[PDB]
UniProtKB/Swiss-Prot annotation:
Molecular function via GO: potassium channel inhibitor activity; toxin activity
Modified residues (Pyrrolidone carboxylic acid): Q1
Annotated tissue distribution: Expressed by the venom gland.
Portion held of the full protein: 24 to 61 of 61
Name of the featured protein: Potassium channel toxin alpha-KTx 15.6
Free-text note on domains in this protein's UniProt record: Has the structural arrangement of an alpha-helix connected to a beta-sheet by disulfide bonds (CSalpha/beta).
Organism expressing this protein natively: Tityus discrepans
Site (Aromatic residue of the functional dyad): Y37
Keywords per UniProt: Disulfide bond, Ion channel impairing toxin, Neurotoxin, Potassium channel impairing toxin, Pyrrolidone carboxylic acid, Secreted, Signal, Toxin, Voltage-gated potassium channel impairing toxin
Length: 38
């Protein structure tokens, strides 16, 4: 999936910004970083 190697300052950061990145609407902090799962 989308692994930008970005630590999670909250899963709610990635889920919003990862939208602007690619084309996804879903990102979660699972392994300590924000991974996007489209």
């Amino acid at each position: 999936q989308i692994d930008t190697n970005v630590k999670c300052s909250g899963s709610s950061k990635c889920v919003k910004i990862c939208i602007d990145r690619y084309n996804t609407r879903g990102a979660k902090c699972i392994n300590g970083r924000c991974t996007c799962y489209p």
